[PDB]
Symmetry: C6
Subunit: 175 residues, 6 copies
């Protein structure tokens, strides 16, 4: 794996962690390296937020052209999750507290268009928030990336250490 | 595993169902509220939807739109299926009429599916609004139910009604 | 089975019988209780008429809210029958003397929309006639229901007896 | 089991097919009218539709739209299939053109299916009207055929033509 | 096989051969009777041309009503071929250098409408050219047909012989 | 079996791919031109399309729209699949967004498929135009490459670049 590619991965893996550590609710632990119940609407919004942080950080650091294939799963995981909010758990105002029956069964194309719209809406939103977040914290993120590329693997605590050195206090979610 | 946050959510969802059941002018059910060939008419099945929706309805009144939970999955699916049968199996919608979809739907037009979907959406929207209104209207005594629920982990309909009679509401029969 | 439910069933089973006994053509025999060739367009219209009589009587006696699940088969049987008239036996002017090929095969959505329209038209019609019929004969029907609820099972002849006592003479179709 | 009503219907349906066959300026067939690798051109298959439709055509002229029967099921299906091939297999429609649907149709646009359905509908409508017109125009001698049909239960084309020559119509050859 | 049918077949089989022998490119050999790499856009256009020659000749000689079932394969073979040009080999300007994925998979109805349009366009065109060709050479074609019906089987050379006797010089493609 | 006509076509198609590869400011590949878990970014895959399209691009510049060949089948299919993934698997289109089609697509709206198809069409159209422009701009030295190709049947990237340096173009590295 060439240094150019390592830089990408680094920015990407930092992005997730950033989202997790800021995420207003999203309960979840951490770790970070260059190698790899009942939820409410808020919880799932924040889960999407985390899932898009990789790609979000990619776009902040490299523009729309430095966007990577490495977010293939994250986009699928996030889109699935938004799709359940809309078609399974009535979490869309437009769509309403309806569930899609069965892989939908005998659903009008109009219902699908509505859903696809709302999935897009939800995802566009969480992704715009993630970019904003990466932006706001670009400088201390750069610092984290440097250490990442150097030591190859960071702990959750060091990530926080670096951010405290910048006056940003991240949520207590590490172990 | 269950955090006081999640446990509260459950309580409210559960108190929501029972509220709907006890006020439901038709629907009848075996109430026991915890944290751990026939013939139905249009009135009946509407009241079934009402009940099925109470949980989510309670979530929204109490926690706003963001507090809406995954816990209602089974509930929303049953409601939707039920309304779906009302429209496509029984002739229970005026727009669609006493027509029965050749059920998987087989060789039904996209136009018809759309009409059906709209009518399913109408039934549910209506009952959902009803459920919320009732929870709203009975927010006060319901809190009291929830407080005891969280405290003792399991309540009987009797206690539930006991709190309600205290507030001056005469809930219907239906327990054991 | 509770008395409220027995009343429903009674009205329902009376409705069919009424339709059969008045039905301008529909050849078919009878019996009535609280427990359970080559046809022309007229014949099949009347068969639909009979199939909808249950629900028709339900709506006359209890309004649109007292409508029951008990007509699940009747609606399917009737709708199937109208659907064959339209898609199998060219009995629709709008659609014309065309047959749908195979569970249709490779048929335009427009053709399906047309068919669905015509099926709806046919069924709406026969159902409006059945309601009208129940209406016109509500009083002697009430009488039949009473005896039904009392004796639990009526013969075709008694049904007629009751109607003759009202000056309505029903078609000779019983044995 | 067969009532005089039903038996009459059958007779008329059967007399309808044969009429079309005997007048059909192209189509050729083995006439025997009872109660109990090749190459066809556009003209030929049109005449096949004509024949296939004669039964129903006869029903409608004689009994109005309400007298239309189930007996034509097989007939309408064959006609429709035939016209369907004309349009989607052979290049026999001007609107659709010498295009052949990749036959189940595979990955054909909804637009194309609609065009095809319209053209199938045109062929059939046209021939149906033709069939009716002919039955109308020959109502009188056809009754006479039907009377003998009902009387003797089975007629030969010969007798059928015999009645027609008597009325002054010279039907074509095609029997045995 | 009746003489009327033999005349049809004759005209049909002559039509192909005509197309082959004139076809500006289409490499292909011949023979003719009353019984039965890497190509460019031009090559495939001409292959369609050959495939439609049968039907084309049928319509020239008998009008739109003398059109036969005998061209069932030719229309399928040609339509398949145009369909590959459009959906497989980016040979349509309207559609562009795109390939349809899999029996298409997950393709919009709009894309299919576009394709169906372009397939129709290509085929309409080649078929109008084939008719024109049959027209232009109707007289010497009649001559060929006569010999065909007489001797039942013609060689490629005789076909040419007849055309040379008319001052038309056909491409050197026989053996 | 291969006619001088067909052999020329092949040469040009092959010279087209290599041209694109050698000029491609990103894409890297194992050049050897004859007649016989990772991470890619948007820039990278665009350059892959460019390469995949070079063959056809070369065909069109040299032989016009009628000279377009069957030889590009595999090429067009790969390009299309790649762009299809860009749009529907990776969030690489602005119109569609960081949305991922639940892949066979499952229960996606006709509207979405249309958006996707349009965007796939945009990527490819753009890169196709790029490929052609480059072939156009380097028509002269490419002929020279083709002449040697037809002459010796197999060329190395080295020779290819050798001709290009002679014309005054400094192509990038990427060979062995
Ligand atoms: Hg990731
Ligand atoms: Hg629940
Ligand atoms: Hg019934
Ligand atoms: Hg028949
Ligand atoms: Hg042929
Ligand atoms: Hg290639």
């Amino acid at each position: 794996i060439s240094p150019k590619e390592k830089e990408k991965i680094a920015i990407h893996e930092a992005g997730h962690a950033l989202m997790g550590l800021v995420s207003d609710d999203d309960d979840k632990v951490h770790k970070i390296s260059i190698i790899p119940h009942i939820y409410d609407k808020k919880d799932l919004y924040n889960k999407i937020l985390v899932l898009l942080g990789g790609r979000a950080a990619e776009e902040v650091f490299f523009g729309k052209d430095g966007i990577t294939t490495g977010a293939e799963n994250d986009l699928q995981r996030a889109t699935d999750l938004a799709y359940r909010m809309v078609s399974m758990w009535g979490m869309s105002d437009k769509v309403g507290p309806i569930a899609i029956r069965r892989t939908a069964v005998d659903t009008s194309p109009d219902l699908l268009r509505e859903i696809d719209e709302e999935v897009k809406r939800i995802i566009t939103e969480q992704y715009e928030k993630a970019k904003a977040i990466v932006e706001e914290y670009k400088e201390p993120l750069k610092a984290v990336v440097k250490k990442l590329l150097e030591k190859e693997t960071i702990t959750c605590e060091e990530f926080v250490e670096v951010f405290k050195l910048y006056g940003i206090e991240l949520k207590d979610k590490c172990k």
